[PDB]
Design a protein around this ligand. Structure first.
Ligand SMILES: CCCCCCCCO[C@@H]1O[C@H](CO)[C@@H](O)[C@H](O)[C@H]1O
Ligand SMILES: CCCCCCCCO[C@@H]1O[C@H](CO)[C@@H](O)[C@H](O)[C@H]1O
Lengths: 301, 301
């Protein structure tokens, strides 16, 4: 069953039942309420994308350099969330990993439909890779994101094959495609924060036509070839409609020879890392991310 | 775990690794080896379809009429199987249900791609409905099929809404769409008779383009409206890549107010009813079908 702490929280975001502005506001005020841990320095930068100037926030850790750079792609169903609402989480990640985090403000639907978010996420990652020196970030680049952001991270890792050298991909309860059949999708369709109705709504805002459902840049699970992708940490949540598809992607990556640590956090829901001050499991997931990136970037415990 | 009887059988059909002719032959000789139970009468008929003359075999039970008529759509991945290889199973069903069974030789891929099988299956069902008098079949019509045939049965039930009055749909370990994410698909991808590689091969032979994956006549799971469909018996197999999607369809039907008895036969695999002389669970599944149809057609135990 759910951790009673989470059940209590749930029993006390109106996606598809309020305006885009209102749902964005509700989400901002929820996510941004978490404590902001001190980092060494924060900078807002503009990354010159192929289709837009991409705002990003750069967090520097108190540890001395050189650093690895983690590109972070926020969740929010391709429609809500932003860099500023993810500031608490990105600060926590920065401190856990002792690395630079660059959180990307990719273009959001419905104003900018698929594949805008993908293009911005990839363009940002490409630019950061080519400018690691600016961050004292010579230990390399990794990519991470949660939920819809995990979709984008997975897709960026695919697009980066034979171009960038991503050291790692961190997929935090990712969406990896269109799922009308998995047990978790059916069983946890309602009552666990992220619902099937929300997922369908987000899909309706982001995608342009049903054809986009078959585009690997939306459904990385059907990519022709997953071999040669960066090693992955894939976190799933037990009570999450997206759980089974995330674990399927982990399995597909493993079958393609990609190293994957797939961990199901029991008793929790989609989005639980954003709840880290309330949900201890969220802190522990952040710590797991920390371990994996300190090892990959620095060969440190 | 698998029933040891089934493990033994598996440990002792080369889809995608031999010619279409050879795989068809191998399947025929396997399936047709089961005993043919006596029925009262068998007739081969030609049903005038919209696109072809449709061969069908009609089985009459020893029980006196009037009868219900079960339209049966064989499995075989839209590519293999036929009425004659399914003769033992259809005879067993006939005797269990005390009803007329009409097994339909729908057009097969790759010679005839999607939606040929659907068109023939629907046209046959429509003609039978309109000619129930020819079979003393006034107690009505139901539809059934296994695996790919369960796909076709489910689709025929959708297409029949507001046209025919199907009394029941029997979906025997059905495929209900494209599934790249379910746990059963991933976990039982290999070693359980029907494999993911076979499924992908069948999909490649049957469908014309990836767009067909989103056509409700291939993926009834994404049909816009499942309400008002006939009551269903949905049989799934525990060790079957198709298991989760069949149970998802059952759940979607239930959510749409359609009565569904969804039963997972544990310890067995896809196709187990075809193995009824070896696999006792197959006989029992046939008996369950019998119970449901005797009730719906005759209000009998
Ligand atoms: C966490 C966010 C995950 C979003 C996954 C969306 C899965 C696809 O969502 C779908 O896409 C279609 C195209 O707009 C629509 O026709 C449907 O309403 C919808 O179910
Ligand atoms: C028991 C038979 C179930 C068959 C389900 C097939 C699921 C879809 O199968 C797919 O369809 C595509 C179109 O041809 C192909 O591109 C792919 O190879 C394949 O995975």
């Amino acid at each position: 069953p759910l951790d009673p702490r989470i059940k209590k929280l749930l029993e006390s975001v109106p996606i598809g039942k309020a305006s885009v502005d209102e749902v964005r506001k509700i989400f901002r005020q929820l996510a941004s309420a978490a404590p902001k841990a001190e980092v060494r320095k924060v900078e807002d930068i503009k990354i010159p994308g192929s289709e837009t100037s991409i705002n990003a926030r750069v967090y520097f850790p108190k540890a001395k350099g050189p650093y690895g750079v983690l590109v972070y792609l926020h969740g929010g169903g391709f429609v809500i969330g932003d860099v500023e609402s993810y500031d608490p989480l990105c600060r926590a990640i920065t401190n856990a990993c002792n690395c630079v985090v660059v959180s990307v403000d990719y273009r959001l639907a419905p104003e900018y439909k698929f594949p805008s978010a993908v293009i911005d996420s990839f363009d940002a990652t490409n630019w950061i890779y080519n400018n690691l020196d600016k961050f004292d970030g010579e230990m390399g680049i990794a990519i991470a994101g949660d939920s819809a952001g995990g979709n984008l991270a997975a897709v960026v890792a695919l697009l980066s094959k034979g171009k960038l050298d991503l050291k790692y991909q961190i997929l935090i309860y990712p969406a990896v495609g269109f799922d009308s059949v998995s047990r978790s999708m059916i069983e946890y369709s309602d009552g666990f924060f992220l619902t099937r109705e929300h997922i369908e709504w987000f899909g309706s805002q982001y995608l342009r036509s049903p054809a986009d459902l078959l585009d690997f840049r939306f459904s990385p699970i059907i990519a022709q070839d997953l071999s040669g992708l960066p090693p992955a940490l894939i976190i799933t949540a037990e009570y999450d409609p997206l759980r089974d598809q995330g674990e399927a992607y982990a399995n597909r990556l493993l079958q393609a020879g990609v190293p994957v640590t797939s961990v199901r956090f029991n008793n929790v829901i989609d989005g639980f890392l954003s709840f880290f001050p309330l949900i201890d499991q969220g802190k522990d997931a952040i710590g797991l991310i920390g371990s994996v990136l300190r090892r990959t970037f620095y060969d440190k415990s």
